[PDB]
Design a protein around this ligand. Structure first.
Ligand SMILES: *[C@@H]1O[C@H](CO)[C@@H](O)[C@H](O)[C@H]1NC(C)=O
Ligand SMILES: *[C@@H]1O[C@H](CO)[C@@H](O)[C@H](O)[C@H]1NC(C)=O
Ligand SMILES: *[C@@H]1O[C@H](CO)[C@@H](O)[C@H](O)[C@H]1NC(C)=O
Ligand SMILES: *[C@@H]1O[C@H](CO)[C@@H](O)[C@H](O)[C@H]1NC(C)=O
Ligand SMILES: *[C@@H]1O[C@H](CO)[C@@H](O)[C@H](O)[C@H]1NC(C)=O
Ligand SMILES: *[C@@H]1O[C@H](CO)[C@@H](O)[C@H](O)[C@H]1NC(C)=O
Ligand SMILES: *[C@@H]1O[C@H](CO)[C@@H](O)[C@H](O)[C@H]1NC(C)=O
Ligand SMILES: *[C@@H]1O[C@H](CO)[C@@H](O)[C@H](O)[C@H]1NC(C)=O
Ligand SMILES: *[C@@H]1O[C@H](CO)[C@@H](O)[C@H](O)[C@H]1NC(C)=O
Ligand SMILES: *[C@@H]1O[C@H](CO)[C@@H](O)[C@H](O)[C@H]1NC(C)=O
Ligand SMILES: *[C@@H]1O[C@H](CO)[C@@H](O)[C@H](O)[C@H]1NC(C)=O
Ligand SMILES: *[C@@H]1O[C@H](CO)[C@@H](O)[C@H](O)[C@H]1NC(C)=O
Ligand SMILES: *[C@@H]1O[C@H](CO)[C@@H](O)[C@H](O)[C@H]1NC(C)=O
Ligand SMILES: *[C@@H]1O[C@H](CO)[C@@H](O)[C@H](O)[C@H]1NC(C)=O
Ligand SMILES: [Ca+2]
Ligand SMILES: [Ca+2]
Ligand SMILES: [Ca+2]
Ligand SMILES: [Ca+2]
Ligand SMILES: [Ca+2]
Ligand SMILES: [Ca+2]
Ligand SMILES: [Ca+2]
Ligand SMILES: [Ca+2]
Lengths: 199, 98, 570, 98, 570, 199
């Protein structure tokens, strides 16, 4: 039994966390799934829970060859119902975030606290307030998820195909997820703590 | 007293075909209901005291009202293919004497 | 006018001198007339874009676009500002630079300043990696079809202002970009076209004192409409004849268009690339719309990948065509680019409604209600899409009855009564099968010779109405259900592979009931095919049928249709 | 099936203090209720199949819905002093799955 | 005029002769002027009083009242009638005999005829028991104070008409009844009085040929008003002084009247024996009604039992008398007989409202709410009936409280608060006990010196509110209830004799709660005395308390007052 | 176990008779008993039941010394609730019978079929239709019951005390119950059959 199951059962064994995890496991299940109820019970989970319970559940370590430890981690936020089936244009996905005033508040904190300050990996303010601004993006419209199942590269589900002339305004917005030194060293510092904590 | 319980069970141990690896909390009902007793209940518990009845073919008739749930809750998990499976109405939330 | 970049980076230190040159700015030309003017802002923004204090320290020269410290810095000013920072260690303030609210290119360019608690250090602590170029590498930005100009300058200005005793040289590597001698501005030779090359990643050579340092140098050539639409190499017209489908909306015929531009972006592509239907008969408007949607592909020019847009144009119908239409046309469409000419040939054919001359079918002589015997079909069964050919069964003893299933437009005939089946004088009948149309009156008929044949065994009294109330195999073929063809039922049993779509049950029609479709004959009664037509709870680990029913279930599934329940359980 | 019964019992054999000599017909409920089963009932009958639960202190929780009466009738007789004694609601008239 | 009997019996036979004498009738006189006239009916009634056929066969002579067959009988007539009998073997028809709808005495007399299928037999088959008298014996009927007359005749007329050759003699045994020689009518000598003798059962001697036969002979002397009311031998006046009772309706004083008549029967006794209240003050009407109801007794006169009526006359009040009334009167009543004089002396007294000078009571220092300590009572406790003396407890620390129980008009004092009991400075108090009246303002007060005394032990947290929720003995005296006097409870346990009124329970007050009265202090709360104040079901073999509660229960009875249930179970 | 219990259980063992006997055992019980519901369920019992079931239940044999066989028989029609507590005048009790047209129909048949025809004991019509007219009087206002518990003398619960002058009209109406040769030989012929039937 891997580590992404050990940190899932520690949310199961809690009273306060399993009651919240059952609330989005139910709204994100089956082929008749409903997306905007599936997302609304994710904001409530990563908002109204203890920070060591959420950060251990989502960001969890693995090996590169350990297939059933990354395949679960990709499927923890239930991407078959949360992420849309067709990949939209990645500037269009930001427009729907700017329209709702909760996703805008959750996005501006991530552009604040996890901005790539130095190309070595130095963050702007803290490498502790980076993941607090990061995990606030999960229940929103711009939900990031782990792309592969062998590594911890994380990006949106979006493409810059039909961009028109705003290619760099889209390539940098995707490079703020897949070419961030700050966010990658923050998630690496958290996974090197989770492989210290109950390993 | 007839009150609510709770426990931890595997999901392969439920016997509904869902193959998985997780644990779920499970609320069942238990207790005794000697305060919802009737005249027929004392009657049947004395007719089954000296064996005054021939017990019918099939089951035994129970004397006291059985302690049963009133409401249910759904139980959600992930399977071996890492897909979210829900089973509606698997765990209780409140018990009662019936 | 546009800036060559969008973000500028500079470092400030404690107690540096007044009039110290910080950086240049650059602005290219859209036209042979535009001269750049440069103004600063007034208030230093910070992290989360809030004004800290008015710029009393940085001034500008508009001529070369030079940023320079007028008043200087002390720790009292950097405690005056860092308390205003809403509680953060201050490493980024910025200003706006306009040339012609919120800073956005090509109007604005935001200039950062990363302050440090030290003064400017001595020259010995300057490694040559921070003597050539700044840490944050530039990313340049050139529109095509432009007057060639000057978009970058090399020298770090406070470095040579404060360490002038070290010689530093800069150079560049048939390319349009050149570096002038003894004046380190970088310039473009000729006007660029994106369609030849679109990304130039150059390398700039720096030499200090002695160390050679090189950095990347990205230049992204932008785009305009310098391209007209073109056939994909001489495929001028596709055509298609409507023969059988005739539904509401169907792709009939298709062509492609190859534009080489990208600029009509996804927001306003619908305003420009518009498909002008050239007119003709109003039947073309009543029956055709020319649907269109673009997609971008990539093509090679001289070793790179330049992208382009592909515009597909599809004839799509509008209504149910009737059968008896027999016409032909020439459907022309103009295509705009802000202009190409396309057309289609379309013919519409008549269709006859012939049936086979003689239908022949046996009937099992112990059959029950709603049993399917044989299919009746117009000669071309599964090719029609939008035609209503309803079947009625006229005689010349009522036993059979036809109801056309709407999916295939085939009539399935079923037994409606059992008492009228065993009669001795009606052992052979005559059912003129009649196949009528609905959007035209054109019907048809065909001849039948039925032979009701079999044994006769009366049934058991301990039988429920449905085959699927049964649980095991022996209680399936000894007891009759409702829609059975030969009085018995039939047991189907699958595998032991968990929740599978192939499960086990007792069914009347092993090819019609646990099939995936709640047929019309199956949805006649609640008892015929309950495990594929019910609307109830399925107690046990299941997976529901998608309109209704049981798609998959763990083990054996036995259903009570009178109580609306199923149990799925091994 | 969960259906109505009937029988003959003495009245001293009821255990309610009435001393007499007569016989009374007595209707009780019996049967099984496998058609009112729930998802929780299969769940609990499998968790009590492999012994996956620790059974709580007190009673055993029952899996199937118990077969209980719905309505009652009075029973009248004469005692040893030849006085008519009635006991209300001592014999059932209709059963059901609960 | 009245008949000497009410029913007459005669036998008819087949083919008897015309003009054959059947029977005489008799009718006595009310007066010296009345001569009896006799008419028959017209239609023979039958079983269930329905006319069969018109009398064509029996005629009458009005002079002696003789019934005789005019036309005669045959089997065709007795099949003409017996089919009309609604299907019965015919052994009784009858007629009416009037002398001055439905036959009732003293207007009518119904004459039976029992027909037989034989003819009249020969004389040899006549035993002398059916030669003297008929089978159904007569019962005679004589009013008193009448002219003496002739009420019976002996001879069986068709017997001597058809067997004349046998000599039969008849006689009677200081009696008024005599039998005349050579004329067998029976007559009365003098006018009778019922009050001397009322039943004469005589014996008539018959001699045939040779056999002596005697039969009973009842004569019931009827009645008139020949009697005036009389005191029961010189008891002329009873008197009674109203001192304490004063309720709405109470028997105060009583006399008796002895009439010797019976005739004013139960239907119309209220019209004749009427109690005329002779007047006086209107206070006598406001406060007295003279109630009266009769009863019949028996008394001996000359060895027999003659009955008579006894008329009791009782003063009964009407309203609640106030206390302060002080009067005296003479209440006279005339009594009618269709006339006697009765009276009463009635005095009404004042009553004072004095209380004892000093009340003295301890209080257990750990006591709970609603505990009864001691009774407070006006000096004459259980003798008053209609006075409201409500008690209020005025102080000069609220701990106690008095509420008068309405049954005894005694005030029971109870503890209302527990927090205000343990205070050190209020260890001795002053409760002026005040006993007020309601129909007069006259109140009273008395002095108290309370000593709150005891230990103090705090209670257990695992205690319910009631003592009677407990089941056994040890859970009774370790745990406190609600109305407890010393913090503990007390267990009472009875016998094993089945459903007994003396059963077992855990009670606060073993002398106040399982007692039979739901007292006012007991009905204060649901928890104090639930097994004598509840309104619920008692599951088990019980027997209910008659207002409410548990009168008797098999074994032990434990009650849940919050759920309103008791269990009675050993 | 005596005979008046054997013929009671034969009404218990029937389905048709115990359902009727339970209907007046319930309305004639307890100290709070109600009289006019207690009587209405007696007419229904002796009317809508089989004649061998009713005639065996009421008229049942015994010995003179057998106390618990006559004491039950006196208490079969539940006299503590059916018969009134105070004994009224016995001509008044006939008046309430004449007012209701069911008791009048039940009384006229008894004055028809059980009239004392001969002083030896010969009845008028049949000694079989005498008890059918007799048992129709039980649920009515003029309910007869066994007076003692040692013999089969049966009379009303009435007295001729306050009769006035109608003494013989009351004495004969009581002598139609306690001096009937016909009714006494009819009930004796029925008890001599019940001591032949299951003795
Ligand atoms: C992680 O894996 C994905 C696909 O397997 C790949 O595209 C990506 O480059 C990988 N990350 C790194 C840092 O190489
Ligand atoms: C720059 O500094 C000079 C003096 O050093 C002052 O006179 C001038 O006003 C300043 N200009 C601005 C724009 O602050
Ligand atoms: C089509 O092109 C012509 C050519 O200038 C232009 O005038 C017209 O506005 C264009 N229409 C659309 C819809 O783009
Ligand atoms: C556009 O083209 C690409 C590759 O040619 C293809 O993957 C994509 O599905 C196309 N989009 C649509 C909407 O057909
Ligand atoms: C064409 O036929 C289909 C067949 O179901 C029908 O649903 C559709 O509405 C029809 N189209 C029109 C325009 O009526
Ligand atoms: C379309 O029809 C025209 C009309 O004659 C004909 O010339 C042309 O060849 C047709 N198109 C094709 C592709 O055959
Ligand atoms: C035959 O089926 C038709 C369907 O429309 C129905 O109306 C009819 O009642 C059926 N025949 C009988 C005898 O029920
Ligand atoms: C009596 O009989 C005689 C003849 O015998 C007849 O003349 C007369 O009318 C009869 N009288 C009656 C009242 O029938
Ligand atoms: C009382 O007796 C007198 C005396 O004849 C009579 O007139 C009066 O009517 C009688 N009153 C009553 C009520 O009987
Ligand atoms: C009448 O008197 C008799 C005997 O004296 C007694 O038994 C009866 O109860 C009395 N009636 C009333 C109503 O007091
Ligand atoms: C007399 O007092 C009693 C006491 O309860 C009361 O019930 C009754 O009504 C009073 N009488 C009158 C006439 O008020
Ligand atoms: C009743 O009062 C009168 C009035 O003085 C008196 O003469 C008489 O003696 C009293 N009655 C009795 C029985 O004392
Ligand atoms: C004392 O009893 C009276 C009864 O009228 C009640 O009103 C009052 O509330 C009680 N005292 C307290 C402190 O509750
Ligand atoms: C029957 O018994 C009662 C009282 O025990 C008695 O009055 C009656 O006379 C008895 N019957 C006969 C016929 O003696
Ligand atoms: Ca171009
Ligand atoms: Ca173009
Ligand atoms: Ca272009
Ligand atoms: Ca099917
Ligand atoms: Ca007299
Ligand atoms: Ca008188
Ligand atoms: Ca007199
Ligand atoms: Ca009490």
């Amino acid at each position: 039994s891997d580590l992404c199951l050990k940190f899932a059962m520690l949310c199961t064994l809690n009273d306060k966390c399993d009651r919240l995890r059952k609330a989005y496991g139910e709204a994100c299940s089956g082929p008749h799934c409903q997306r905007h109820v599936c997302l609304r019970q994710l904001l409530t989970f990563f908002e109204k829970a203890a920070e060591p319970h959420a950060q251990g559940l989502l960001l969890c370590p693995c090996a590169p060859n350990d297939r059933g430890c990354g395949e679960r981690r990709r499927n923890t936020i239930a991407p078959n119902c949360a992420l849309p089936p067709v990949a939209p244009n990645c500037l269009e996905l930001r427009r729907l975030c700017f329209s709702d005033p909760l996703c805008r508040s959750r996005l501006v904190d991530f552009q604040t606290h996890c901005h790539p300050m130095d190309i070595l990996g130095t963050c702007a303010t803290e490498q502790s307030r980076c993941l607090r601004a990061y995990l606030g993006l999960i229940g929103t419209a711009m939900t990031p998820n782990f792309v592969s199942n062998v590594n911890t590269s994380v990006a949106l589900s979006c493409t810059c195909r039909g961009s028109g002339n705003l290619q760099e305004e889209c390539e940098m917005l995707e490079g703020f997820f897949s070419h961030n030194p700050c966010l990658t060293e923050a998630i690496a510092a958290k996974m090197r703590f989770h492989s210290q904590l109950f390993s | 007293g007839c009150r609510l319980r709770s426990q931890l069970v595997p999901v392969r141990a439920l016997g509904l075909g869902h193959r998985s690896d997780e644990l779920v909390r499970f609320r069942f009902c238990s207790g005794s209901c000697r305060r919802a007793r009737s005249p027929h209940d004392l009657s049947l518990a004395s007719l089954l005291g000296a064996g005054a009845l021939r017990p019918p073919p099939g089951s035994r008739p129970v004397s006291q009202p059985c302690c049963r749930p009133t409401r249910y809750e759904a139980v959600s998990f992930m399977d071996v293919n890492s897909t979210w499976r829900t089973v509606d109405r698997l765990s209780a939330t409140a018990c009662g004497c019936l | 006018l546009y800036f060559s970049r969008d973000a500028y980076w500079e470092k400030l230190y404690v107690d540096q001198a007044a009039g110290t040159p910080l950086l240049y700015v650059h602005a290219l030309r859209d036209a042979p007339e535009e001269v750049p003017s440069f103004r600063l802002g007034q208030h230093l923004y910070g992290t989360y874009r809030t004004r800290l204090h008015e710029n009393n320290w940085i001034c500008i020269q508009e001529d070369t676009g030079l940023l320079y410290l007028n008043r200087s810095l002390d720790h009292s000013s950097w405690e005056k500002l860092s308390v205003r920072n809403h509680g953060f260690p201050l490493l980024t303030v910025y200003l706006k630079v306009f040339l012609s609210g919120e800073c956005q290119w090509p109007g604005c360019a935001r200039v950062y300043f990363s302050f440090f608690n030290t003064s400017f250090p001595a020259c010995s602590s300057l490694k040559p990696r921070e003597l050539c170029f700044p840490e944050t590498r530039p990313s340049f930005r050139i529109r095509e079809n432009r007057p060639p100009g000057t978009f970058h300058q090399f020298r770090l200005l406070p470095v040579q202002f404060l360490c002038p005793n070290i010689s530093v040289a800069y150079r560049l590597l048939g390319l349009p970009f050149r570096c002038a001698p003894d004046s380190l501005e970088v310039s473009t030779r000729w006007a660029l076209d994106r369609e030849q090359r679109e990304k130039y990643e150059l390398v700039a050579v720096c030499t200090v004192h002695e160390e050679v340092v090189m950095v990347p140098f990205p230049v992204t050539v932008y785009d305009e409409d310098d391209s007209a639409p073109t056939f994909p190499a001489g495929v001028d017209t596709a055509s298609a004849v409507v023969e059988f489908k005739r539904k509401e909306d169907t792709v009939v015929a298709t062509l492609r268009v190859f534009d080489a531009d990208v600029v009509p972006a996804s927001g306003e592509l619908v305003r420009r690339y518009t498909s002008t239907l050239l007119p003709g008969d109003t039947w073309a408007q009543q029956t055709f719309r020319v649907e269109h949607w673009p997609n971008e592909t990539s093509v090679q020019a001289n070793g790179s990948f330049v992208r382009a847009t592909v515009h597909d144009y599809r004839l799509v119908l509008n209504r149910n065509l009737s059968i008896s239409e027999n016409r032909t046309m020439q459907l022309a469409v103009l295509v705009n680019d802000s202009v190409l000419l396309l057309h289609f040939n379309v013919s519409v054919l008549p269709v006859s409604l012939h049936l086979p001359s003689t239908y022949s079918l046996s009937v099992s002589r112990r059959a029950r209600r709603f049993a399917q015997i044989g299919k009746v079909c117009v000669e071309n069964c599964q090719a029609f899409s939008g035609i209503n050919v309803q079947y009625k069964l006229h005689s010349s003893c009522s036993t059979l009855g036809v109801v056309t299933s709407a999916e295939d437009t085939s009539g399935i005939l079923f037994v409606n009564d059992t008492k009228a089946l065993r009669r001795p004088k009606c052992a052979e009948l005559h059912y003129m099968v009649v196949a009528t149309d609905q959007q035209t009156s054109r019907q048809a008929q065909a001849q039948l010779l039925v032979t009701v044949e079999g044994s006769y065994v009366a049934e058991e009294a301990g039988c429920p109405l449905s085959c699927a109330v049964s649980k095991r195999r022996l209680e399936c073929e000894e007891c009759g259900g409702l829609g059975s063809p030969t009085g018995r039922c039939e047991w189907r049993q699958g595998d032991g592979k968990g929740i599978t779509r192939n499960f086990s049950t007792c069914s009347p029609s092993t090819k019609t009931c646990p099939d995936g479709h709640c047929d019309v004959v199956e949805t006649q009664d609640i008892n015929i095919c309950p495990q594929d037509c019910l609307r109830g709870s399925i107690v046990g680990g299941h997976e529901p049928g998608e309109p209704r029913g049981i798609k998959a279930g763990y083990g054996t599934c036995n259903c009570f249709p009178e109580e609306e329940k199923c149990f799925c359980e091994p």
